[PDB]
Amino acid sequence: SNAMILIDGKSLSKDLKERLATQVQEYKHHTAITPKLVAIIVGNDPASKTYVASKEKACAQVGIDSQVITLPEHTTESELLELIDQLNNDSSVHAILVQLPLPAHINKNNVIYSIKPEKDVDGFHPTNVGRLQLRDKKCLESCTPKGIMTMLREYGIKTEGAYAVVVGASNVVGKPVSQLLLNAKATVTTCHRFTTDLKSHTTKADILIVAVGKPNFITADMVKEGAVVIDVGINHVDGKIVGDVDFAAVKDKVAAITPVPGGVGPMTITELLYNTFQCAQELNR
Amino acid sequence: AMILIDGKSLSKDLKERLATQVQEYKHHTAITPKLVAIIVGNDPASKTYVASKEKACAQVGIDSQVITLPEHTTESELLELIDQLNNDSSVHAILVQLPLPAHINKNNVIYSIKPEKDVDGFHPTNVGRLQLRDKKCLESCTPKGIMTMLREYGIKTEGAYAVVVGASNVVGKPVSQLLLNAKATVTTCHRFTTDLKSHTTKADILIVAVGKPNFITADMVKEGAVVIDVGINHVDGKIVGDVDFAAVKDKVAAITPVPGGVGPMTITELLYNTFQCAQELN
């Protein structure tokens, strides 16, 4: 028989937001500082407006201030860098986020590099990426990988000496989560689209992290009995949201598994909130 | 049919190729790359390393300058000097010879170097840039050298299974990231890994960086493996690899000897990095 525990992100995110709200009010009482997030959106992309809206709603829930600066699509990179320079030097702003994607005429990496690492709440600045790997403590960690580790921590999933296989090598998820796992003393394998015999790896994993954006890609035969399975996929399939793991099939095999929806997805914005609070406190240390 | 991955011969060839590239660049731009190296104190091994880096610069036509500070130099004094060099446009590459004295915080010193002059590649921005595939990255010299060895010897990395033994910041983590960028499936193992052998015995490419003499035995290696030994262990008056070479050599497809394998590639890649700094600065 297997544990078949549901790693419930919706309930965990709710608990974590309530916990954070309490801390934010404590901090405000001690310092009169309310953490403030500035989100920059360039242009009109509909999905981008929705993402930003969800971020502001989450802020309001926990008592964090937010401001959205909407710039026209025709904004140049130099103009956006100018705005970010003003935000970097504005002590009322603790966390700066640039909603992706940016217009064709702007290079996102130049934009991210212009953000003070201490205000880079997404954890995408090269210094934060590097500090993650280098186990340095000023690091703003990327929200989705941080969220994954938070689930593992709160569910008591031991990482030390565990064999973890991460399927997908993206910058936003796969590579930073592999680095977080390795810092947590797991043995880590990172697989991707050039991996031959993927199943030979995934079937040995104690902890299996799936981040490929391919609906129902990971099937039962690819997962180890007693495995912990974390499904980062958010695939839109005919109005439904479906994960990268064939949940119906795999759930009977596992010690624990994240459903989709209601698994990793809500943890991403939750960790953004914690990262905003981290920015405010460390700027004012 | 075993291949010796010979770093001494490869380093010589690579320096000849670089010397020509540096001369071509100078013809077109009148710019000659310049490396500044700082040494704090008098550690004789540190002095020998810095002397080897100056010699290597001279061999390829790169300018070098060594600034020697006394052992009691304060962290603030060293950071002042680094700031000056950051902002000197005659200086393309800055390096600080390690180890620093115990009273100075290495990480603060490294952070203070401009990333685009940080030839050793351990600034956090360079570490992140490597993972991000940002072309402005200065890749750390030993991991870069390991990848160069694989490339020059025609070792296939796309779809290869690579196991990296040792998860150090200086070698194991960056080399794993380079291997992933090169399209290998990569496992990173360390002192907390259980059943190490179940991984290492499957590796098509085995990179070993544990600083333990003769640590990897024949039973830990796959037949036909390509083995890269980053160990330089001083023991029994001898320099010994992390791999038991005599024990594994008759079963591998290729292996780096120690000495004469990875060691020489480290300074070679320093010179390449110094030339990278000169071209991007301009």
Q: Do residues A154 and A65 share a domain? A: no
Residue B186, chain A, CB below 8 Å: the answer is: yes
Q: Do A187 and B173 touch (CB under 8 A)?
A: no
User: Does the beta carbon of A114 lie under 8 angstroms from any beta carbon of chain B?
Assistant: no
B254-255 vs B3-4, strand pairing mode: parallel
Residue B240 φ/ψ, nearest 5 degrees: -125, 140
In a domain, B282, yes or no: no
Domain ranges, residue B65: 29-114
| Contact (CB, 8 A) for B199 and B163 | yes
B8 as an active site residue: the answer is no
What span, in angstroms and rounded, lies between the C-alpha atoms of B170 and B179?
A: 15
Are B166 and B62 found together in one domain? no
Q: Report DSSP letters for A117-174, one per residue.
A: GGGBTTS-SHHHHHHHHTT-TTPPPPHHHHHHHHHHHHTT---TT-EEEEE---TTTH
Q: Are residue B171 and residue B255 in the same domain, yes or no?
A: yes
Q: Are residues A252 and A151 in the same domain?
A: yes
- Taking the C-alpha atoms of residue B132 and residue A126, their distance in angstroms, rounded to an integer, is 8
CATH number assigned to the domain comprising residue B33: 3.40.50.10860
User: Residue B34 falls within a domain, yes or no?
Assistant: yes
| Dihedral (Cα; A269, A273, A276, A281), 10-degree rounding | -150
A194 and A81 share one domain: no
Residues A150, A240 within the same domain: yes
CA B21 from chain center: how many Å? 21
Cα–Cα nearest to B138, from B274, B279, B281, B282 = B274
Residue A123 falls within a domain, yes or no?
A: no
Q: In this complex, which of A126, A169, A190 lies closest to B134 when CB atoms are compared?
A: A126
What resolution (Å)? 1.9
**Residue B268 in domain:** no
| Position B123 in a domain | no
Separation of alpha carbons B200 and B223, rounded Å:
11
Task: Give the CATH number for residue B185.
Answer: 3.40.50.720
Kindly give, in sequence order, each residue whose CB lies less than 8 Å from that of residue B217, ignoring residues fewer than 6 positions away.
B244, B247, B248
> Number of structural domains, chain B?
2
Which neighbouring-strand residues pair with A6?
A257
Query: What is the CB neighbour count within 10 angstroms for residue B138?
Result: 28
In-domain check, residue B167: yes
As a whole number of angstroms, the distance between CA B279 and CA A120 comes to: 29
Q: Is there a domain that residue B66 lies in?
A: yes
Question: How far apart, in whole angstroms, are the C-alpha atoms of residue B81 and residue B112?
Answer: 10
What is the signed CA dihedral for A136, B229, B64, B100, rounded to 10 degrees? 40
Q: B173 in contact with A at a CB cutoff of 8 Å?
A: yes
Residue of B nearest to A107 (CA): B134
